[PDB]
Amino acid sequence: GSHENSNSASEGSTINYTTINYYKDAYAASAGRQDMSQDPKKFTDPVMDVSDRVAQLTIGNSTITTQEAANIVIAYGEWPEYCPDTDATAVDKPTRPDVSVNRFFTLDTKSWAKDSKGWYWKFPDVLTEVGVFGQNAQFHYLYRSGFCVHVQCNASKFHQGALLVAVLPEYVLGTIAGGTGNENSHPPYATTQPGQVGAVLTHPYVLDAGIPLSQLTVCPHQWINLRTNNCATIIVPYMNTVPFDSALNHCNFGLLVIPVVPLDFNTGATSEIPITVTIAPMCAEFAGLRQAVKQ
């Protein structure tokens, strides 16, 4: 016959394929002709405005005023949003705290030195133990949220250097395998989930994960070039293969700050050049209430 069941992996996309088939199940069908869709404007230009430096963003009881801004990036061209009913799976009514959790939290500050390797933080690991957000993350099994990341770094017009600020979804870390490569070692909880203090990259060139830093720009990113800007901002939507997930067992993405062009300045100029990270979860939703669990 020819009429069948709707069980192909690509049946819920606005991209159709022409196929041939004689079995009752759709996945048995051939790959077919490939339509030719394209969205080059979500990676190459996921910027704000699809006097830009001058700004001020407010959320919750917190407000940031950025002026040497390099505009704002909206990761993959999508805004954070509460989970829609079609995608939802868990049946209990989620709690949406709003103001007490969707606001700006400012984590520890790091110091940029002429020989710094680079740092990274995991989300939501960084806030699991901070304010009301953290508390909700502990009392609930499920969590879902978006993020606003603001990285700050000032310096005089006589300093120079460039930080690459990027977001890498599912940032799985690897070990140097005993050096020789004969030891199947693994990163300890302290390295995979460094908490709010973040961690240091030992081999930035390969992002401590066997992949080229040179290609990290294929991820939502922004640069902080001292002669141009002193802060970067990136809005990040929720990304996962599931609608909600544990804020404890799974880190949706990592934030990397790497000095691609090393800090330099003539001796006599301020040598303490800090980098500060301020983040705000957006559209935080929690579900599966029970007692508090720290991990």
């Binding site: 520890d108 500050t109 790091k110 110091s111 301020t270 303490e272 800090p274």
Partner: protein, 48 residues
């Protein structure tokens, strides 16, 4: 708007002009506290 004497120290009283502004300088330590004061406007202190 009128000026707040945030720098209302016992050591200023003889050189009062100094109370009209407080300093910031190159820090050697991150996240230091620069100054603090109560927001109570009718209370004795900077607001006076």
């Amino acid at each position: 708007e009128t000026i707040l004497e945030v720098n209302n120290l016992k050591t200023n009283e003889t050189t009062p002009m100094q109370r009209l502004c407080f300093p910031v300088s190159v820090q050697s330590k991150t996240g230091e506290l620069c100054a603090a004061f109560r927001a109570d406007p009718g209370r004795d202190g900077p607001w006076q």
